Amino acid sequence: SALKRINKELSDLARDPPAQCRAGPVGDDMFHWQATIMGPNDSPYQGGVFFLTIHFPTDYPFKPPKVAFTTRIYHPNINSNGSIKLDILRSQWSPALTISKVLLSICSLLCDPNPDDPLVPEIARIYKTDRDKYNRISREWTQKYAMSRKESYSIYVYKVLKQVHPDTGISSKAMGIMNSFVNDIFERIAGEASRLAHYNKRSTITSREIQTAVRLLLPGELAKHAVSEGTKAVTKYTSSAKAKTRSSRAGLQFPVGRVHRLLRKGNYSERVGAGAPVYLAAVLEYLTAEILELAGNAARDNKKTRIIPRHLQLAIRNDEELNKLLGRVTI
CATH number at residue 260: 1.10.20.10
Same domain, 22 and 75: yes
Q: What string of DSSP letters covers 177-240?
A: HHHHHHHHHHHHHHHHHHHHHHHTT-SEE-HHHHHHHHHHHS-THHHHHHHHHHHHHHHHHHHS
DSSP letter assigned to residue 83 = B
With beta carbons less than 8 A apart as the criterion, state whether 153 and 254 touch.
Answer: yes
Elucidation technique? X-ray
Of 181, 205, 199, 155, the C-alpha closest to 283 is: 181
Among residues 92, 124, 145, the one where a domain terminates is 145
What is the domain count for the chain?
2
Say yes or no: 72 and 97 in one domain.
yes
Instruction: Tell which of 145, 172, 192 closes a domain.
Output: 145
Residues 72 and 192 in one domain: no
> Is the bond leading into 277 cis (omega within 30 degrees of zero)?
no
Structural domain boundaries, residue 113: 2-145
Query: CATH code at 60?
Result: 3.10.110.10
Same domain, 88 and 204: no
- Asked whether residue 25 is assigned to any structural domain, the reply reads yes
Supply the angle between the helices 154-164 and 172-199 in degrees, to the nearest 10.
110
Give the residue from 89, 117, 145 where a domain finishes: 145
Do the Cβ atoms of 230 and 279 come closer than 8 Å?
yes
Residues 166 and 80 in one domain: no
Give yes or no: residues 281 and 168 share one domain: yes
C-alpha span between 165 and 83 (Å, rounded): 55
Largest CA-CA distance found in the chain, in angstroms, rounded: 85
Residues 139 and 176 in one domain: no
- Shared domain for 223 and 303, answered yes or no, is yes
Residues 195 and 316 grouped into a single domain: yes
Name which of 21, 111, 22 is nearest 75 in CA terms: 111
Please state, in angstroms and as integers, the Cα–Cα distance from residue 146 to each residue in 78, 134, 202, 236, following that order: 15, 17, 14, 33
User: Where does residue 303 rank: exposed (0-12), middle (13-18), buried (19+ CB within 10 A)?
Assistant: exposed
The answer to whether residues 184 and 107 belong to one domain is no
Q: What is the experimental resolution, given in Å to one decimal place?
A: 3.6
Is 331 among the domain residues? no
Q: Is residue 13 part of a domain?
A: yes
- Residue 164's H or E segment, with its range, is helix 154-164
